[PDB]
Design a protein around this ligand. Structure first.
Ligand SMILES: [K+]
Ligand SMILES: [K+]
Ligand SMILES: [K+]
Ligand SMILES: [K+]
Ligand SMILES: [K+]
Ligand SMILES: [K+]
Ligand SMILES: [K+]
Ligand SMILES: [Mg+2]
Ligand SMILES: [Mg+2]
Ligand SMILES: [Mg+2]
Ligand SMILES: [Mg+2]
Ligand SMILES: [Mg+2]
Ligand SMILES: [Mg+2]
Ligand SMILES: [Mg+2]
Ligand SMILES: [Mg+2]
Ligand SMILES: [Mg+2]
Ligand SMILES: [Mg+2]
Ligand SMILES: [Mg+2]
Ligand SMILES: [Mg+2]
Lengths: 98, 126, 113, 79, 312
RNA sequence: AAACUCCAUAUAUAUAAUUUUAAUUAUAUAUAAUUUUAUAUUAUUUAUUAAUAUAAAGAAAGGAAUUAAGACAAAUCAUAAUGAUCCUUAUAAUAUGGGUAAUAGACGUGCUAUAAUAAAAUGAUAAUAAAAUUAUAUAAAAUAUAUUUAAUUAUAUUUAAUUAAUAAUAUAAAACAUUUUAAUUUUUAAUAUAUUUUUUUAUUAUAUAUUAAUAUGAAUUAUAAUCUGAAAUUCGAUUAUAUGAAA
RNA sequence: UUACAGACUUAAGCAGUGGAGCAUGUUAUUUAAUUCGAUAAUCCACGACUAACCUUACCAUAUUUUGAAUAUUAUAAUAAUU
């Protein structure tokens, strides 16, 4: 506390130089914090998982010899045909050209 | 703890034959994580279920060993690791004060590029 | 042929709904423009620069699309898509967490004492 | 309350055309800060449903356009 | 004793389908999500077809993902009823049935094995070990999936009187009490065989000062005399006998109806008459009990099959 | 079913080269009680008994989970999933802004307060915790400003250590001691006085109003500044000066 | 219809609720919209462990039309096979 401020400022400046630190004696807002914050993009963008997962549609070309059946897809197609037979099918979609 | 303790015992046996003085496994404080849920899917926030997860920890220390032998230990125990066990290794290398040949951020680069673009140079003109 | 978002994006590998698609798109575009937004924010908040350059950066920041905004990312349940009471330790809503926990799907989760 | 050291909330607006032609400026940027240049110009400010016509005076500088385009109707009870 | 031996208790690590610990929590979450997605994908690879009228459905249990420091092992149990060539001939020795073709792409195929594709998804070496179960009532998960997906024509118009009868004669009604007491007698015999071995090896003397510090009793052979792999292992193994099983149905098979079939014992007396102590899996399920639920869709809608097995 | 269990507790062994230190600890395994014994008294189905007390031994006193059946055709189609039915240039999809924050009355649940067995200051060789958190971070010390010697509080500048039994969030708080405290002339002040002296006594002055709101209370509101964010207008948080309602 | 037993049910004690301000939920009303439930016990800081944008399910305006899926059949650009 009795150490003159000039002496303590000389130590701070030299110390900052040796340790590659930003010496801002005035205190002006410099934005240095923004330049030092970490990039969180990679972690944020992986929230929902790796998109390059093997999918059922890729199995018919990876393993041509084997014939796989998608029961969920097969069930859906049967429900579509059933509704067509009851007359409850879907209306034909309007074409933009019209 | 079961796989953790079994694997720790195996490390001590590997080290002995490698000539590595080993201490442990020292048990470190178990971490407990807790989550409280409401059992019902929609309402009834008065009945809450408790869930927890315990992280068991063990410390094995190696002494008075050369770096090459220490790497052999880590390689072998890695090759024969057990399910559900994780491993962190802190290596300590004593060195001389002065060595021979020794032992720019993306944001800063873009700032320089932006400050040279016309949308910014058109103002910096003095 | 007509993707709903301005830029082509890959689909998440698991459960999908419109809200998940919208949130995922914002996550991908935030990552592509994170550096750009940080560089403009630096110029706009650095008091050593002239006010004109600072105001130019602020104007450019206000003109960025909403899908580049970090504050618009919302954590959703990766199994159901629900965006309320989502535990970040598992990225699941409370109900899906309980169901997965009791099935033994969460690596070290057991019922409390 | 935006920190004064950050400056005004400047938004892209067509002020040059409104100063050389006198046309009203239709905008949804209710957050925009009324800059001292805007004084005298005519703005049509969205309120969520309609665009409220408002001319800017010198006592409006510093405020934000949204402050002059109320978004709700006054409350009334069926007494 | 029970929890200090690998043959007398289930390791708690097996209570979880993903067996992993990563210091990087984000990578742990990612690995967990990858295990669920691959599990779903594998469920879609079990249904195979040779011709329009030859669809072979392989019933697969949930996967056990063993994450070690160097590799990931994906272990699952599967049941397949070979209905295409169930003969007494050796014609199956000259062709690969569809189930063998499916199992050989997991690891054997040199160009497009599923392990190499997954090794890039996980960024670590991956192995897949399919284990064949010959009965559908040895795994609660396989049993529920079979009923739900294959026995629908038996319980869609009520539970057939023959269907229920078959689900009640699966196992002979073993006497749990004598099996429990036989197990405890074997343990006592083994424990008394080792104590006698040491007592004799000490009374026969196999530095008096050193005779107060060391505890080395003598040659390993004498301490373990008459305790070999041919008589100790198979007698101490637990959960070896199915002693109870309950199969429930529910849903619409115009109102939902529930039918419950209960047959056998749902407890273990090995824990009562002995110091052996029971353990709860995930802290709420008794170790002996294995419960699984499988749902499917019919004309009316969703119906659930809840099966519970008690192995002691 | 209960128990057998698991937790807590007590104890033993093992582990830690006791500077990752808390060994007064950590966590693996094992043991222990659902306590036991003696005596007197009162009842009994009077005996090899209960209720009681007395004596002795003991650390021993608490918890969780533990499943079967049925009902309310109780909640949920808005955690996700299924049938039927309906929409398909729209009841699907995207963007900008607005709304979900409106305000007569009413209801539920909270917070703060209405003063003296209770509020406010101050307490640095730093009174005394536990359980958690920190790679989609926790942020020390220091300096600068508000702002005054300094401290305190807030923010800025800077970003030490630690991705952790190590460093940080974080010197716990109440407690306790001293001082102060409107209503209260129960005070304060001027003289004199004392063997109550941080105090006593005497004589003067110290207000009036007043069932009442103060040095209680902190709602409301003015102005300025700050924090997060691309953005704080509808509609966020903090600080300073001023405002000071009901109770 | 009888008789039993149980609890059911009060009391005592501590601090509260019911009164003021504010916070919050609900109702009612309003509104272009004030999203939708739950809404006696068993709703009412409940769904919701955080509504400025996002979240969002509502409103106004503008805009997209096989759209996020699977398959069929064409067309191409590309790499292998032959
Ligand atoms: K110590
Ligand atoms: K809003
Ligand atoms: K008080
Ligand atoms: K403390
Ligand atoms: K007052
Ligand atoms: K505001
Ligand atoms: K806003
Ligand atoms: Mg958010
Ligand atoms: Mg309802
Ligand atoms: Mg609301
Ligand atoms: Mg202290
Ligand atoms: Mg500090
Ligand atoms: Mg202190
Ligand atoms: Mg105090
Ligand atoms: Mg006050
Ligand atoms: Mg009053
Ligand atoms: Mg009240
Ligand atoms: Mg919107
Ligand atoms: Mg909104």
């Amino acid at each position: 506390m009795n150490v003159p401020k000039a002496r303590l400022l000389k130590v701070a400046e030299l110390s900052a130089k040796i340790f590659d630190q930003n010496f801002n004696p005035s205190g002006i807002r410099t934005g240095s914090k923004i330049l030092n914050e970490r990039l969180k993009g990679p972690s944020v963008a992986s929230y929902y998982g790796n998109p390059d997962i093997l999918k059922f549609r890729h199995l018919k070309t990876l393993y041509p010899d084997i014939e796989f059946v998608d029961l969920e897809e097969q069930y859906r197609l049967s429900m579509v045909e059933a509704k067509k037979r009851r007359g409850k099918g879907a209306p034909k979609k309007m074409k933009k050209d019209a | 703890n079961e796989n953790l303790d079994f694997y720790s015992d195996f490390i001590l046996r590997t080290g002995y034959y490698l000539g590595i003085p080993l201490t442990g496994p020292k048990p470190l404080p178990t971490r407990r994580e807790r989550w409280t849920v409401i059992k019902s899917p929609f309402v009834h926030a008065k009945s809450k279920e408790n869930f927890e997860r315990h992280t068991h920890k063990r410390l094995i220390r190696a002494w008075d060993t050369n770096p090459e032998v220490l790497q052999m230990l880590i390689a072998y125990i890695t090759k024969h690791s057990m399910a559900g066990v994780g491993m962190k290794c802190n290596f300590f290398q004593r060195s001389e004060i002065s060595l021979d040949l020794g032992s720019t951020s993306a944001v800063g680069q873009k700032v320089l590029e932006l400050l040279d673009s016309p949308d910014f140079k058109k103002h910096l003109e003095k | 042929g007509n993707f709903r978002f301005p830029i082509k994006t890959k689909l998440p590998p698991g459960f999908i709904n419109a809200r998940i698609l919208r949130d995922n798109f914002k996550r991908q575009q935030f990552k592509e423009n994170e550096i750009l937004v940080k560089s403009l924010k630096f110029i706009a908040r650095n008091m050593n620069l002239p006010t004109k350059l600072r105001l130019e950066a602020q104007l450019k920041l206000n003109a960025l699309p909403n899908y580049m905004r970090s504050t618009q990312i919302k954590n959703r349940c990766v199994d159901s898509g629900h965006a309320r009471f989502v535990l970040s330790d598992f990225r699941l809503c409370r109900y899906q967490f309980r169901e997965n926990a009791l099935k033994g799907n969460l690596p070290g989760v057991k019922k409390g004492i | 309350s935006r920190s004064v050291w950050k400056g005004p909330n400047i938004v892209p607006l067509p002020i040059r055309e409104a100063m050389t032609k006198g046309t009203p400026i239709r905008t949804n940027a209710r957050a925009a800060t009324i800059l001292p240049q805007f004084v005298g110009l005519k703005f049509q400010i969205h309120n969520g449903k309609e665009y409220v016509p408002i001319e800017i005076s010198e006592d409006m500088v510093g405020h934000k356009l949204g402050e002059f385009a109320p978004t709700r109707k006054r409350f009334s009870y069926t007494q | 004793g029970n929890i200090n031996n690998k043959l007398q208790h289930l390791n708690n690590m097996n209570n979880w389908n993903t067996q992993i610990y990563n210091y990087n929590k984000n990578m742990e979450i990612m690995n967990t999500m990858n295990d669920k997605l691959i599990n779903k994908l594998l469920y879609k690879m079990m249904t195979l077809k040779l011709n329009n009228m030859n669809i072979n459905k392989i019933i697969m249990s949930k996967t056990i993902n063993q994450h070690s420091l160097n590799k990931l092992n994906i272990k699952f149990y599967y049941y397949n009823n070979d209905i295409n060539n169930n003969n007494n001939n050796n014609n199956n020795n000259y062709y690969m049935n569809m189930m063998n073709k499916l199992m050989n792409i997991m690891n054997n195929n040199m160009n497009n094995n599923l392990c190499n594709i997954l090794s890039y998804y996980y960024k670590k070496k991956v192995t897949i070990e399919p284990i064949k179960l010959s009965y559908i009532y040895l795994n609660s998960d396989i049993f529920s999936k079979y009923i739900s997906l294959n026995d629908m024509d038996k319980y869609n118009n009520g539970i057939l009187t023959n269907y229920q009868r078959m689900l009640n004669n699966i196992m002979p009604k073993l006497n749990d009490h004598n099996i429990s007491m036989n197990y405890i007698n074997n343990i006592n015999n083994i424990n008394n065989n080792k104590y006698n071995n040491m007592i004799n090896l000490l009374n026969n003397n196999n530095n008096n000062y050193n005779n107060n510090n060391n505890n080395y009793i003598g040659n390993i052979n004498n301490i373990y005399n008459n305790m070999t792999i041919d008589n100790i292992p198979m007698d101490i193994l637990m959960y070896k006998y199915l002693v109870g099983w309950s199969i429930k149905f529910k849903g619409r098979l115009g109102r939902t109806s529930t039918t419950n079939l209960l047959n056998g014992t749902f407890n273990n007396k090995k824990y009562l008459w002995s110091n052996i102590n029971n353990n709860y899996k995930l802290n709420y399920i008794p170790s002996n009990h294995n419960l699984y639920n499988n749902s499917n869709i019919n004309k009316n809608g969703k119906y659930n099959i809840k099966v519970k097995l008690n192995f002691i």
